[PDB]
Amino acid sequence: PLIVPYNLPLPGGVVPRMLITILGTVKPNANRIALDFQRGNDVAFHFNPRFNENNRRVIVCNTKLDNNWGREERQSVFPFESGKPFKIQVLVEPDHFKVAVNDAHLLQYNHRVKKLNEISKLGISGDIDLTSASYTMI
Ligand SMILES: OC[C@H]1O[C@@H](O[C@H]2[C@H](O)[C@@H](O)[C@H](O)O[C@@H]2CO)[C@H](O)[C@@H](O)[C@H]1O
Helix, strand or coil, X not given: CECCCEEEECCCCCCCCEEEEEEEEECCCCCEEEEEXXXXXXXXXEEEEEEEECCEEEEEEEEXXXXXXXXXXXXXXXXXXXXXXXXXXXXXXXXXXXXXXXXEEEEEEECCCCCHHXXXXXEEEECEEEEEEEEEEC
């Protein structure tokens, strides 16, 4: 297992056809999970499953620029379950990040940060046991 929060370097940032794969298991009675694709202090793509926001489960996505969160993009399709193993795949496409969970398409997030090759770290945090975090060029 990996220690959470975990930092995965993305050498030379991201680029279309780069696939990032996160394997782990959600803890019992989880509250949150977060992926933070960072460009220095900015967060190009924040992917944040919330297990209890007003007794609803929702995935919140956003970008943080100069310490300011922008407009949230919310997804009520929620494939995670407390206690269960998951796979998150984030595929960088030309106009968006494409996210699949457990081999099922979940959402896309249009690029707000344009300098893809400066998005050089992925932070993985929250109520999970982390098994692996890696990338491959497809
Ligand atoms: O936008 C992602 C960002 O949200 C923060 O929580 C928001 C919350 O979603 C919103 O409903 C409320 O109005 O303000 C909060 C703070 O901006 C999180 O704290 C942060 O971790 C990110 O997930």
